[PDB]
């Protein structure tokens, strides 16, 4: 589905969008919010959060959309792999524009290359720029 | 790119994601709202509206995400092509799960087959079901 995998010197962990029925370790979500804040503070990142509303009965309801799984995978990688180590992410869907931008900025600020294989392309993020040239 | 095209007996119209600087005819958006409300009336279709929030200093700001271009294309087709005519749509991205369901329901409730060629696959929607078997 919307799955991402991180591969760390042969070792593999899978991540999905937020599922409160199967929560990841809170330490990982804490790292994500910490990285998001540092991106906002240190490189002027405009952090996105998405939500929807459904036309239910007796009024209306809003529902926060869960951030995409590769951001969780990247936070896990920043927690578990050495400083400056390349982060290798595999996705089964095409990386969206907002996640692609997130990856660029992470590669710059945390001084780690990111190699992402999404549905269609290898994206190599180095120092804030991607090998795809932002066409994918 | 968020573009869709409709092809009607060789004639071709392109649709982009909603742009207030370049908006299409009012009749098209009215038809789409009529379709969406008919879906709710007949099958109870959960019509969602998506939003993004970006937190900025001057004013923390919410932006509405605009519906995807193929629903506009389908509304245009329902307006401008004869009853029961097949609707042929081309998209340069993968159709999302919500739009794929929308197409399935339109094919049933408006008695039109839809042939959609997205980024990777031909989807042939007939009577509520797709040739991809909902794996794409
Ligand atoms: Zn994304
Ligand atoms: Zn790229
Ligand atoms: Zn869609
Ligand atoms: Zn299909």
Numbering used by the authors:
A (entry chain A), B (entry chain G): 825 to 960
Publication excerpt:
As crystal soaking experiments with substrate, product or different short RNA trinucleotides were unsuccessful, we attempted co-crystallization of OTP86DYW with the well-characterized deaminase inhibitor tetrahydrouridine (THU). Finally, we obtained crystals of OTP86DYW with space group P21212, which diffracted to a resolution of 1.65 Å. When employing the coordinates of OTP86DYW, structure solution by molecular replacement failed; however, four copies of a truncated model missing the gating domain were successfully placed in the asymmetric unit. Explaining the failed molecular replacement, OTP86DYW had clearly changed its conformation substantially in the presence of THU towards an activated (OTP86DYW★) state. The conformational change mainly involved the β-hairpin of the gating domain (which now adopts an extended β-strand conformation), and its connection to α-helix 1 (gating domain) and α-helix 2 (deaminase domain). Remarkably, the conformational change of H892 from the main chain dihedral angles angles ϕ/ψ = 58°/42° (inactive) to ϕ/ψ = −74°/152° (active) and a concomitant repositioning of its side chain elicits a pervasive impact on the Zn1 coordination geometry. The restructuring of the active site reduces the zinc-water/water-E894 distances from 3.07 Å/3.93 Å (inactive conformation) to 2.15 Å/2.53 Å, thereby activating the mechanistically important water molecule. In OTP86DYW★, distances and angles of the zinc ligands are in agreement with a catalytically competent reaction centre. Furthermore, the strand length of the β-finger is extended upon activation, still maintaining the original backbone hydrogen bonding residue pairs of the inactive OTP86DYW. The side chain of H890, which shields the active site as a counterpart relative to the zinc coordination sphere (formed by H892, C920 and C923) in the inactive OTP86DYW, is repositioned far away from the active site by about 13 Å in OTP86DYW★ (compare Fig. 3b, c). Unexpectedly, THU could not be located in the electron density, which implies a crucial role in triggering activation but not as tightly bound inhibitor.
Nuclear-encoded pentatricopeptide repeat (PPR) proteins with a C-terminal DYW domain have been characterized as site-specific factors for C-to-U RNA editing in plant mitochondria and plastids. Here we report crystal structures of the DYW domain of an Arabidopsis thaliana (A. thaliana) plastid RNA editing factor, OTP86, as the outcome of a solubility and crystallization screening of over 100 different DYW domain constructs from 30 PPR proteins. OTP86 was characterized as a site-specific factor for an editing site in rps14 transcripts. Herein we describe structures of a DYW domain and find that, apart from a cytidine deaminase fold, DYW domains contain a characteristic DYW motif, stabilized by a zinc atom, as well as a gating domain that controls zinc-mediated catalysis sterically and catalytically.
